[PDB]
């Protein structure tokens, strides 16, 4: 109970919160970059090479051995764009039917689909599921292919684990993509999508929980894309925290469509 | 005197520490992406039969991912070739193994490390024996004996003569036992993934233009031998200084950044 000591109390909170935000942003950046490399891998070794060098076995092995490159990812997978006119051909060739992600049932007729054809074993349950059959994933797929850049979903409960997380999606294009393409051209040139599951609930808890002073601090991360409807990305909420003092640390996960922030308070 | 001295010191520390962080992070990102390449060659060249990687594919993949390796002027893969295998190897590749210094056909050696895949930026490495340069040779041995990334001392790189360091990763055959001995590591070696860190050019690009660059003198040293520091970056000059920490990831080597004011 001292006014000089309270100034230092906030100083320590500022430093602790800022450090954790920097660690999170940096680890997400490293993960995004390594997912970009996988999109280029699929383009180079599956599409450009005649014949393809990538089968499910090969993708699984390579992504397992490189999992350390993608620290905030529980899994990565590649989904191919399939238009309805092609669906029966695609299914016959793969010897399986495109399924919905909610129940694993055969998909109803849709204009197009994004079935997962390659998966890291950690997310093997994605194989044959249509990634356009979840709304977060669908919206991400469209924005990925229309913008040509990595995009993030809003926070949602991931398949199987139900862990609160986000998905990162990169488009993969055909060689026919023109230089300086329009959005219409990007869509026409889309081959598929490289998706990575950021299991924030588990993997950020793992990151934060090992840090000295973790027991002293409450850390929440919000998606603040919509100012009037902030969305919990990480943290309880929802917790015994010091109401009288907080700090906002900045986060940039690199998708200009989305905005996020970190808020830290002391327990007591 | 006096408060202005204290602030002058604080600015030096801040400027130097920030440059050190930027350099260490770019080096770290580079190393991690080179490691991924070593894993790629292992998976596609050795684990798949037949090989599912070739020069065309390696050149494309490495060109497209060059942005992932910011401090590297190029990357290449050299295969381990023991002398008994040389005839068959040269017949297969339709070229002769060459010396690094002259590009002359290699005299007989017990083994060699010819470059078989190369990013086009270092295309001139193709067919050169990386064991024919002493820095690279030492790095190759330590890479394969330790099973981890290793760095050379600073030296002038081929063609450009830019002062730099080489990063080398071992690639092993699938016959490598678990918890292998060094002898087992050697026997299981397939080859070596090497990346040329062009320090002279690419660190100058990183640091050289930053605000306040004209006010300070920046050096990076290899201090592996404390009594024989080797310049990795900066001039050859031998009061107010600051040492900022660097860790480039090879326990065999030590490095530091030193910054000073001019006057
Ligand atoms: O994994 C994807 N999406 C995706 C996968 C591949 C390609 C594009 C997107 N979404 C998931 C939801 N729950 N766990 S993973
Ligand atoms: O490029 C390598 N070394 C290397 C290449 C491939 C595998 C192992 C080592 N050394 C170079 C010196 N000057 N420019 S590059």
From Swiss-Prot, chain B:
Autophosphorylated predominantly on His residues. Activation probably requires a transfer of a phosphate group between a His in the transmitter domain and an Asp of the receiver domain. N(6)-dimethylallyladenine binds at residues 136, 158. Kinetin binds at residues 136, 158. Mostly expressed in roots, specifically in the vascular cylinder and pericycle, and, to a lower extent, in leaves and flowers. Present in seedlings. Trans-zeatin binds at residues 136, 158, 168. Induction: Rapidly induced by dehydration. Down-regulated by Pi starvation and induced by cytokinins. Disruption phenotype: Reduced sensitivity to cytokinin (mostly in shoots). Narrow vascular cylinder composed mainly of protoxylem cell files, with no apparent metaxylem or phloem. Hypersensitivity to ABA. Strong drought and salinity tolerance only in the presence of CK. Reduced cytokinin repression of several Pi starvation-responsive genes and increased sucrose sensitivity. More rapid germination, reduced requirement for light, and decreased far-red light sensitivity. Reduced sensitivity to N-isobutyl decanamide. Impaired benzyladenine (6-BA)-mediated repression of the iron uptake pathway. Dihydrozeatin binds at residues 136, 158, 168. Changing residue 124 to E: Loss of activity. Residues 49-258 form the CHASE domain. It is found in: Endoplasmic reticulum membrane. Residues 1-263 are extracellular. Cytokinins (CK) receptor related to bacterial two-component regulators. Also binds the synthetic urea-type cytokinin thidiazuron, a potent defoliant and herbicide. Functions as a histidine kinase and transmits the stress signal to a downstream MAPK cascade. This protein undergoes an ATP-dependent autophosphorylation at a conserved histidine residue in the kinase core, and a phosphoryl group is then transferred to a conserved aspartate residue in the receiver domain. Homodimer. Interacts with AHP1, AHP2, AHP3, AHP5, AHK3, AMPD, FBR12, WNK5 and At4g15630. This is Histidine kinase 4. The chain holds residues 150 to 416 of 1080 of the full protein.
């Amino acid at each position: 109970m001292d006014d000089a000591n309270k100034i230092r109390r906030e100083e320590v909170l500022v430093s602790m919160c800022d450090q954790r935000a920097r660690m999170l942003q940096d680890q997400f950046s490293v993960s995004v970059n390594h997912v970009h490399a996988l999109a280029i891998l699929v383009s180079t070794f599956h599409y450009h090479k005649n014949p393809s060098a990538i089968d499910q076995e090969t993708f699984a092995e390579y992504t397992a051995r490189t999992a350390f490159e993608r620290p905030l990812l529980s899994g990565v997978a590649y989904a191919e764009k399939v238009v309805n006119f092609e669906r029966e051909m695609f299914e016959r060739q793969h010897n399986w039917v495109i399924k919905t992600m909610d129940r694993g049932e055969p998909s109803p007729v849709r204009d197009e689909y994004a079935p997962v054809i390659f998966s890291q074993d950690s997310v093997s349950y994605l194989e044959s599921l249509d990634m356009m059959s979840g709304e977060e994933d669908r919206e991400n797929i469209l924005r990925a292919r229309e913008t040509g850049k990595a995009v993030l979903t809003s926070p949602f409960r991931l398949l199987e684990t139900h862990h609160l997380g986000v998905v990162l999606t990169f488009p993969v294009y055909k060689s026919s993509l023109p230089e300086n393409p329009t959005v219409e051209e990007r869509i026409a040139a889309t081959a598929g999508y490289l998706g990575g599951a950021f299991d924030v609930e588990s993997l950020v808890e793992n990151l934060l929980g090992q840090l000295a002073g973790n027991q002293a601090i409450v850390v929440h991360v919000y998606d603040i894309t919509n100012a009037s409807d902030p969305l919990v990305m990480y943290g309880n909420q929802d917790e015994e925290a010091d109401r009288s003092l907080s700090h906002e640390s900045k986060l940039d996960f690199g998708d200009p469509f989305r905005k996020h922030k970190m808020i830290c308070r002391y327990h007591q």
